[PDB]
Amino acid sequence: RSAKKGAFVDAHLLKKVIDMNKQEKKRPIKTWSRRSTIFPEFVGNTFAVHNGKTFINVYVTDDMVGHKLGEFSPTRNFKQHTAN
Amino acid sequence: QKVNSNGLRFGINKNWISRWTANSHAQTAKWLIEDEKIRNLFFVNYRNAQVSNVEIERTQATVDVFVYAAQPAFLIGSENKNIQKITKQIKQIIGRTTNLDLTINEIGSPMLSARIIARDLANAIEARVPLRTAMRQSLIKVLKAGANGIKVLVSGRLNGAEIARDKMYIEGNMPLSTLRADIDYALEKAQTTYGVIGVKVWINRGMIYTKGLNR
Amino acid sequence: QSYYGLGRRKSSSAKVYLTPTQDKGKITVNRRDPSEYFPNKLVIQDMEQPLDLTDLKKNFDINVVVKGGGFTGQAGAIRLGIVRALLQFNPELKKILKSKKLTTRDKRVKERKKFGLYGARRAPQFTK
Amino acid sequence: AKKSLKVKQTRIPKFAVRAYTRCQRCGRARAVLSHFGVCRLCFRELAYAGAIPGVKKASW
Amino acid sequence: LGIDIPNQKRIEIALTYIFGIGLSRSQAILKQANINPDKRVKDLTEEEFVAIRNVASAYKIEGDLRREIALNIKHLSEIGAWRGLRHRKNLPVRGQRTRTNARTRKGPRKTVANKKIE
Amino acid sequence: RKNRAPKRTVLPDPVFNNTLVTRIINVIMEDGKKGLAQRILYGAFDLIEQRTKEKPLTVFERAVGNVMPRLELRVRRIAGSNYQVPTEVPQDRKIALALRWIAMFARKRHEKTMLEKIANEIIDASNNTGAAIKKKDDTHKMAEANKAFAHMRW
Amino acid sequence: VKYPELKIKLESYDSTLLDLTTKKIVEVVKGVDVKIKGPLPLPTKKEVITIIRSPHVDKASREQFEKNRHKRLMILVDVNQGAIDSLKRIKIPVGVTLRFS
RNA sequence: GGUACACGAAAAACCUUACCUAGACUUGACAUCCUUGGCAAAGUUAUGGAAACAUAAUGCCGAGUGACAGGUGGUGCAUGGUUGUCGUCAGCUCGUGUCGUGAGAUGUUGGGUUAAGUCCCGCAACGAGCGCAACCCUUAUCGUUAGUUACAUUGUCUAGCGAGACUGCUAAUGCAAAUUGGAGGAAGGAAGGGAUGACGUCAAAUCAUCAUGCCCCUUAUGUCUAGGGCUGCAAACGUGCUACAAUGGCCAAUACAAACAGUCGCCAGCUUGUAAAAGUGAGCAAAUCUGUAAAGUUGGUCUCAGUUCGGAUUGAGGGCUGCAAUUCGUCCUCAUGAAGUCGGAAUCACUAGUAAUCGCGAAUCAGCUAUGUCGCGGUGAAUACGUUCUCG
Incomplete structure (x- = not known):
């Protein structure tokens, strides 16, 4: 899903979301690729997204549907408000 | 200072040895690479006989090679013992189907x-x-x-x-x-x-x- | 009759046929009016200053064909053609036109911008 | 691990998401042409050798 | 609309400084009212003013647009998001370096002591 | 060590036959082009025309001539200080600074159109009221403490 | 006829080779072929490629290499059987590139 | 510090990546001692999975194994190659030779005199080499080449080439260099630009372009895939840039190009369109056809300010390709209308097409907020008092 097209997903990170969906969903799945847009199923879901070494969990909900899994996860690190 | 005079005097003083002309720029680099490998095979083979130049003249499937050997005995010998090996080995890099034409040219x-x-x-x-x-x-x-x-x-x-x-x-x-x-x-x-x-x-x-x- | 002038200026090239006649002078470029073809400036009055520097514009119907450039480069090219046609006709007038470099090609074109340089010789500020 | 760089250069990524090019000899894939697949240093050095027929010095 | 209405000045463009009504929507209001861009006149039509509060008042209140944008920003920044993080840091969101830029959020580039190579 | 060198100055305009207005066009052009400055300058000659009934030639000459210096305070330094010795300022630089000062003052008093302000400054320099005459005034009045510097050479 | 219109472009970086090839085309067809257009130098498509010089950082002397592409346009509208019988003695030089058009 | 900084980097959605790790690789993807032949590891369809790596077959050729392959693994006073600073500085050396016991001067020095060590005049020097200059290429006239996809106001468009200017001429004429006089002229007197910057200098930069010595690592310094940074931010410096407006802002018509790119691409045309785009569709393998020439011009407008300046950031919706667009691309629309109303130390490019404008096509690019680069063209500055201070 982009600003240029409708809701479209690569369907390999949603793949396991759905595979667990037919089996009484539990949210966390080891996915840090940034190729899946969201759907009304990603509500409550969290994914361990790689920053540079660790895979931080990121909460997903049904607020807006105009982004991908990469936008819904902090891809970088900030200054930590440091004056050094 | 003194910018390298290598490229500074190709075309105006030095000559270009390997000419190649292909179609649209997809395999032009392939032609360049094949030409340089085939022509450098001689240069890396002989260092005592010191073969100098081999111009591979290629243009739209018209390839012409010309070896300039300083010592014919080192490049031919008895029963052409050397050249057939070249006729074999370049045949593996230039292609089995294509012809291999070259001759030892005299130069002063x-x-x-x-x-x-x-x-x-x-x-x-x-x-x-x-x-x-x-x-x-x-x-x-x-x-x-x-x-x-x-x-x-x-x-x-x-x-x-x-x-x-x-x-x-x-x-x-x-x-x-x-x-x-x-x-x-x-x-x-x-x-x-x-x-x-x-x-x-x-x-x-x-x-x-x-x-x-x-x- | 058939006077044949050639001119070049600022990547503009032009020929002109000039013939003696008692019209307004056929003021035109590519056989069309310079209303919006050229900017309305002093350059549109300088358009016939070769005719002002020589026999009046009431002669030599300007049959000018042009290629490339702009308007001032165009104007310089076509006026160089005009002065060369005048040379083909009466070259005593060639003297004053050459005195300001009209019959001779003025050979003033934008200097080529160079590698790294911003323009012909523009360079960025750098002290330390 | 320059050979990793080179063997990833000879291989092509499975998508057009992933893509680059680099010289057969040089590392530092930055500033590489698509007309020869040769990096800037290797290209300049072979051009000072007159590899490409017609590489001249500009004098306008 | 009624906001940023100039006196003895073209009504056509002064609306662009309003929050929520730019050039295109300003022109939409103007041509829907057919204000016929003026010669430095506050308003060409006097009767159509009532037509304003008949049709132009029916236009969406930009005060509500402000709070809609505010709540959308709240949702975007509160959830985990790189653009949400950029919102949280009060800096360019779509991705711009703050090494020298960002002379709209960090003030007029307050020059501080340099902590750099030694 | 640059020595005496010529200058390239465009020849006088056919419609007025003054080389000074041409150097004005040379030095006023916005974005470094005459494709747009000449229109407004000819407008300005027109604006001078219906305002105070001043023909451009005489008003422009009486405006430019009254802002022109005669003293060159040639620099001579000590590597820790500096002083000026008064020689005769070159005539080419005389007219150059005259025209430059006229042009750069001509374009001020930010208002509705630049035609009114440029005609206003032309008129002001015409009437010798202080807007550019101050340049000629200072170029001789501040050369009074520097007039003492004419008693010795260093 | 072999070609209803022979719009053969021959081009290279070497003008002397282009001159040689275009002349050989000229006099070999001169007498056995008509409706030809002789040697026509077209405007060049020359360009320059600009690269850095030092191994590591430098942008003060950007080295440059020039590639010049001439263009000779030969327009032989008609090609005849006798034309080819007399023209079987033309070949493609190592620099000059001919178009089949 | 400059000889480090719009860098190496002519474009980062993960690779590029040299950094990190997760899944994973164990003489490794590659490379081969060895060993044998007989026909194939591909790619595909499921799958744990983020994909590998584990899955099975499917489609002259393979196939395993130690040392190694390879190492962006380091070591720029260990290095080459390459590159910049003084320097496109006017000077730099040597053979022979004189003399100072000599370090060496020297020829080169120096007068006029030059772009040059340019000439001569004289010089313990005669000469030569290096550099520069000059040769050479480019802008510049006439003729010549062919004529279309130029044209067709037909040789307008072009470079292939020739005649072709060089104090040539004349006088002012200096023992010599060499200025100008006026005309012929394309060039008239280093015609203008580019051009090799000599030994050296930075014990220059370059181990990480590349080649690398020594050592090392190897069942890891080997490789596959997934993600992130190369656009963070207390931030500064740099860098152009953005304007600080009424020649300007907006609206409308608006000419003149060069230039390169382009074959499931330029993509015309055509329609929906503010527009991205959506669909639609030739010619062009590119003098065919396509990717506007604009500023300027022509009229209205705003009538002085954070403004009809500037559009900053921002949110929402559409959009391009990329398997999927978010960062680690972008386009458009709508909405945002900040600062700056010309800014100190510092200052950089400059003798004309110069400084500045305006746009265009492309290089890398399936993407490019590279405001950057190659260019290209259009418009188009004064100035040079003398080096005062400094650099060299």
């Missing part, structure tokens, strides 16, 4: 090039002999058997950790300013146990009559 003053002169200078530097006499003989030979001014230099080290007795040898017509000098220049990155040693040679291949054209 075969040391108007720089690569082989640099190789000989390195051999004299590391020939296990009084070195100064060796380079005096080598320079006398290059100046004697037919040639214009020479410009030979060696940089790096003295087989130690410092080059203190480097000798800059300039003879005859070495104008870097003149755009008709017909000077061919080459560099050699010699491998030894003291790091890479740079042996560089400028050589004037004959004063052409005020020509800016690739002759």
Whole structure:
């Protein structure tokens, strides 16, 4: 899903979301690729997204549907408000 | 200072050896790579016979190679023992189906090039002999058997950790300013146990009559 | 009759046929009015200053064909053609036109911008 | 690990998401042409050798 | 609309400084009212003013647009998001370096002591 | 060590036959082009025309001529200080600074159109009221403490 | 007829080779072929490629290499059987590139 | 510090990546001692999975194994190659030779005199080499080449080439260099630009372009895939840039190009369109056809300010390709209308097409907020008092 097209997903990170969906969903799945847009199923879901070494969990909900899994996860690190 | 005169005088002084013309720029690099490998096979094969130039003239499936051998006995020998091997080995890199055409061409003053002169200078530097006499003989030979001014230099080290007795040898017509000098220049990155040693040679291949054209 | 002038200026090239006649002078470029073809400036009055520097514009119907450039480069090219046609007709007038470099090609074109340089010789500020 | 760089250069990524090019000899894939697949240093060095027929010095 | 209405000045463009009504929507209001761009006149039509509060008042209140944008920003910044993080840091969101830029959020580039190579 | 060198100045305009207005066009052009400055300058000659009934030639000459210096305070330094010795200022630089000062003052008093302000400054320099005459005034009045510097050469 | 219109472009970086090829086309067809257009030098498509010089950082002397593409346009509207019988003695030089058009 | 900084980097959605790790690789993807032949590891369809790596077959050729392959693994006073600073500085050396016991001067020095060590005059020097200059290429006239996909106001468009200017001429004429006089002229007197910057200098930069010596690592310094940074931010410096407006802002018509790119691409045309785009569709393998020439011009407008300046950031919706667009691309629309109302130390490019404008096509690019680069063209500055201070 982009600003240029409708809701479209690569369907390999949603793949396991759905595979667990037919089996009484539990949210966390080891996915840090940034190729899946969201759907009304990603509500409550969290994914361990790689920053540079660790895979931080990121909460997903049904607020807006105009982004991908990469936008819904902090891809970088900030200054930590440091004056050094 | 003194921007490298290698590319500064191709086209106006030096000649271009390997001509290739393909179609739209998809496999032009492939033509370049194949030509350079096939032509450098000779250059890496012989270092005592010192084969100088092999022009692979390619244009739209019209490939013409021409070897300029200094010693026919080293490139042919009895029963053509050498060339058939080339006729085999290049056949593996140029293609089995394509024809392999080449002939040993005669040329005067075969040391108007720089690569082989640099190789000989390195051999004299590391020939296990009084070195100064060796380079005096080598320079006398290059100046004697037919040639214009020479410009030979060696940089790096003295087989130690410092080059203190480097000798800059300039003879005859070495104008870097003149755009008709017909000077061919080459560099050699010699491998030894003291790091890479740079042996560089400028050589004037004959004063052409005020020509800016690739002759 | 058939006077044949050629001119070049600022990547503009032009020929002109000039013939003696008692019209307004056929003021036109590519056989069309310079209303919006050229900017309305002093350059539109300088358009016939070769005719002002020579026999009046009431002669030599300007049949000018042009290629490339702009308007001032165009104007310089076509006026160089005009002065060369005048040369083809009466070259005593060639003297004053050459005195300001009209018959001779003025050979003033934008200097080529160079590598790294911002323009012909523009360079960025750098002290330390 | 320059050979990793080179063997990833000879291989092509499975998508057009992933894509680059680099010289057969040089590393530092930055500033590489698509007309020869040769990096800027290797290209300049072979051009000072007159590899490409017609590489001249500009004098306008 | 009624906001940023100039006196003895073209009504056509002064609306662009309003929050929520730019050039295109300003022109939409103007041509829907057919105000016929003026010669430095506050308003060409006097009767259509009532037509304003008949049709132009029916236009969406930009005060509500402000709070809609505010709540959308709240949702975007509160959830885990790189653009949400950029919102949280009060800096360019779509991705711009703050090494020298960002002379709208960090003030007029307050020059501080340099902590750099030694 | 640059020595005496010529200058390239465009020849006088056919419609007025004054080289000074041409150097004005040379030095006023916005974005470095005459494709747009000449229109407004000819407008300005028109604006001078219906305002105070001043023909451009005489008003422009009486405006430019009254802002022109005669003293060159040639620099001579000590490597820790500096002083000025009064020689005769070159005539080419005389007219150059005259025209430059006229042009650069001509374009001020930011208002509705630049035609009114440029005609206003032309008129002001015409009437010798202080807007550019101050340049000529200072170029001689501040050369009074520097007039003492004419008693010795260093 | 072999070609209803022979719009053969021959081009290379070497003008002397282009001159040679276009002349050989000229006099070999001169007498056995008509409606030809002789040697026509077209405007060049020359360009320059600009690269850095130092191994590591430098942008003060950007080295440059020039590639010049000439263009000779030969327009032989008609090609005849006798034309080819007399023209079987033309070949493609190592620099000059001919168009089959 | 400059000789480090719109860098190496002519474009980062993960690779590029040299950094990190997760899944994973164990003489490794590659490379081969060895060993044998007989026909194939591909790619595909499921799958744990983020994909590998584990899955099975499917489609002259393979196939395993130690040392090694390879190492962006380091070591720029260990290095070459390459590159910049003084320097496109006017000077730099040597053979022979004189003399100072000599370090060496020297020829080169120097007068006029030059772009140059340019000439001569004289010089313990005669000469040569290096550089520069000059040769050479480019803008510049006439003729010549062929004529279309130029044209067709037909040789307008072009470079292939020739005649072709060089104090040539004349006088002012200096023992010599060499200025100008006026005309012929394309060039008239280094015609203008580019051009090799000599030994050296930075014990220059370059181990990470590349080649690398020594050592090392190897069942890891080997490789596959997934993600992130190369656009963070207390931030500064740099860098152009953005304007600080009424020649300007907006609206409308608006001419003149060069230039390169382009074959499932330029993509015309055509329609929906503010527009991205959506669909639609030739010619062009590119003098065919396509990717506007604009500023300027022509009229209205705003009538002095954070403004009809500037559009900053921002949110929402559409959009391009990329398997999927978010970062680690971008386009458009709508909405946002900040600062700056000309800014100190510092200052950089400059003798004309110069400084500045305006746009265009492309290089890398399936993407490019590279405001950057190659270019290209259009418009188009004064100035040079003298080096005062400094640099060299």
